[PDB]
C-alpha cells in the first residue's frame, strides 16, 4: 500500500557526504513513479531536492544542488537514496522522502505520498550522551520532573512510566546553548497524597549516543 | 528561474474564507497547469491538498479549491475551521525538469481565547549539586497569544547571564509553552536569599520563586 521510510545517519562532519536512503514497500522501485526529496531547515520553508524516475532510473536536482547531489535507486532493497557531498551547515535540515501521483506529467510536483522526516545536523561536535536529573516536588496536586541536560544532537524522547503516565505531562522542547549542546524538561502534575507511594519513573532516550535512562523521581 | 511568492501571512475567522496567493511567472504558473497546494502541521509531513491548479486528492475537503489567472495560483478555503491553521506552500514545475517552491504562508484562524501563562519553577537537584553546577528550571505553559518575556532576579536585582531561553511553541491544544533555565555556580545558589522567574505575559507578569534549602 506503499509506504515510505527515510534510513540514515542523524550527524555528518563538514566536508563529508550526507547520506540517506528510503525504503519503499507495497510497489517496485522499477515502477513509473517520481521517486523525490524534499528537505526543510526547522522553522524555515520547504526546498525541492530532486527526483528519480522509477523505469529509466534518470535523474534531476535544483540548479543549487546539480553539482553535489545524486539521487539513484536501489534495485536490491527496494529503495532510493540521497548522497549531497561536501556537507555544511546549510545542510542541516528534515528530510522527506516522497512519492508522486501516477502518471501525471511533473509527478514530482504533485507528492501525495510521504515519509516521516528525518532530521540530520551537519556539525564537527562529537555525539554526547545527556545527564538526566529528577526535579523532585515539593494544592491537592504537585508537580515532579526530569532534567535532561546537555546532550548532542537531536533529539531525545521522554515518557513516563513507559507511557502509562499521560494524563498532566509536558515535555518541553529543548534549548540551543552557546556551548553547542541541548537541554530540555519535562514535567507531570500529580495527586500529592501519591507520592512515597506510586513511583514515578522519567524514561530518557538519546538513540544518537545509544543511551537509554529510567530515572526515578522521588520526594523529600 | 525565481521563486514562487506567497504571502507571510494570512488570518481569518470562523465559518468565513480566506485565499492565499501564489505569484509565479508566465513561464511556470502561466504556461503550465501543474501548480501544487500543501498543508502543513507543526511537525509533520506536508499533505497534498491541490495538484494540477485546480484537482482535489483522494479525501481532500471540497472547502479547499484552487486556480489561477496569469501568472498568479490562489488557494482558497471556505468553512474555516481551527484545524485549518497550517503553513501552506504552492508549488509549481519549471522547465529543465524540475519544481519551485514558495515561501509559505501562516494561516492564523481568529477568535482564540486568550489564556495566561502556568508557570513552574525548579531549584537545582541534589544530584546535580553533587556534580558541582546548578541550574534553574522555569517552565512556562498553556498560553495564549504566544508572546512571553522572561525576567531573572537573584534575590530582587536582576540577572541576564548565564540565561537561555527558548522560542515559544504550540502545544496540542493550540495553546503556546516555553522554558528558561538559569545556569549557576553551587556558591551563587547557596549565598542567595531566593531566585525568581518572573513571566510577563501581554500586560500581566506571573511570578515564582525557589529558595536554598
Known amino acids: 500500500q506503499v509506504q515510505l521510510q527515510e534510513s540514515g545517519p542523524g550527524l555528518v562532519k563538514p566536508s563529508e557526504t550526507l547520506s540517506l536512503t528510503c525504503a519503499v514497500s507495497?510497489?517496485?522501485?522499477?515502477?513509473?513513479?517520481?521517486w523525490t526529496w524534499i528537505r526543510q531547515t526547522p522553522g524555515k520553508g520547504l526546498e525541492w531536492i530532486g527526483y528519480?524516475?522509477?523505469?529509466?532510473?534518470?535523474?534531476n536536482l535544483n540548479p543549487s544542488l546539480r553539482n553535489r547531489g545524486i539521487i539513484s535507486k536501489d534495485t536490491c532493497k527496494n529503495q532510493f537514496s540521497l548522497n549531497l557531498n561536501s556537507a555544511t551547515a546549510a545542510d542541516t535540515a528534515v528530510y522527506f522522502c516522497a512519492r508522486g501521483m501516477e502518471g501525471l506529467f511533473a509527478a514530482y510536483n504533485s507528492l501525495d505520498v510521504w515519509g516521516r522526516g528525518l532530521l540530520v545536523t551537519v556539525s564537527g561536535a562529537s555525539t554526547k550522551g545527556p545527564s538526566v536529573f529528577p526535579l523532585a516536588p515539593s494544592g491537592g496536586t504537585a508537580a515532579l520532573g526530569c532534567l535532561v541536560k546537555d546532550y548532542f544532537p537531536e533529539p531525545v524522547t521522554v515518557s513516563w512510566n513507559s507511557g502509562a503516565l499521560t494524563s498532566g505531562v509536558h515535555t518541553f522542547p529543548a534549548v540551543l546553548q552557546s556551548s553547542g549542546l541541548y537541554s530540555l524538561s519535562s514535567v507531570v502534575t500529580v495527586p500529592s497524597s501519591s507520592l512515597g507511594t506510586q513511583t514515578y519513573i522519567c524514561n530518557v532516550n538519546h538513540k544518537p549516543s545509544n543511551t537509554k535512562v529510567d530515572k526515578r523521581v522521588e520526594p523529600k | 528561474q525565481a521563486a514562487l511568492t506567497q504571502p507571510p501571512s494570512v488570518s481569518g475567522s470562523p465559518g468565513q474564507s480566506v485565499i492565499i496567493s501564489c505569484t509565479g511567472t508566465?513561464?511556470?504558473?502561466?504556461?503550465?497547469?501543474?501548480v501544487s497546494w500543501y498543508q502543513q502541521h507543526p511537525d509533520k509531513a506536508p499533505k497534498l491538498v491541490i495538484y494540477?491548479?485546480?484537482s482535489r486528492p483522494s479525501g481532500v475537503s471540497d472547502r479547499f479549491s484552487g486556480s489561477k489567472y496569469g501568472d498568479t495560483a490562489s488557494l482558497t478555503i471556505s468553512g474555516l475551521q481551527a484545524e485549518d491553521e497550517a503553513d501552506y506552500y504552492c508549488s509549481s514545475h519549471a522547465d529543465e525538469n524540475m519544481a519551485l517552491f514558495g515561501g509559505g504562508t501562516r494561516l492564523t484562524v481568529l477568535g482564540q481565547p486568550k489564556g495566561a501563562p502556568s508557570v513552574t519553577l525548579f531549584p537545582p537537584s541534589s544530584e546535580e549539586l553533587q556534580a558541582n553546577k546548578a541550574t534553574l528550571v522555569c517552565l512556562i505553559s498553556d498560553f495564549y497569544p504566544g508572546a512571553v518575556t522572561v525576567a531573572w532576579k537573584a534575590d530582587s536585582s536582576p540577572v541576564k547571564a548565564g540565561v537561555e531561553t527558548t522560542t515559544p511553541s504550540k502545544q496540542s491544544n493550540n495553546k503556546y509553552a516555553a522554558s528558561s533555565y538559569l545556569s549557576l555556580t553551587p556558591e551563587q545558589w547557596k549565598s542567595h536569599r531566593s531566585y525568581s522567574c518572573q513571566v510577563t505575559h501581554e500586560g500581566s507578569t506571573v511570578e515564582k520563586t525557589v529558595a536554598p534549602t
Open positions: 508566465s513561464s511556470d504558473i502561466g504556461q503550465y497547469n501543474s
Open positions: 507495497g510497489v517496485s522501485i522499477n515502477d513509473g513513479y517520481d
Open positions: 528519480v524516475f522509477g523505469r529509466s532510473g534518470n535523474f
Open positions: 494540477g491548479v485546480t
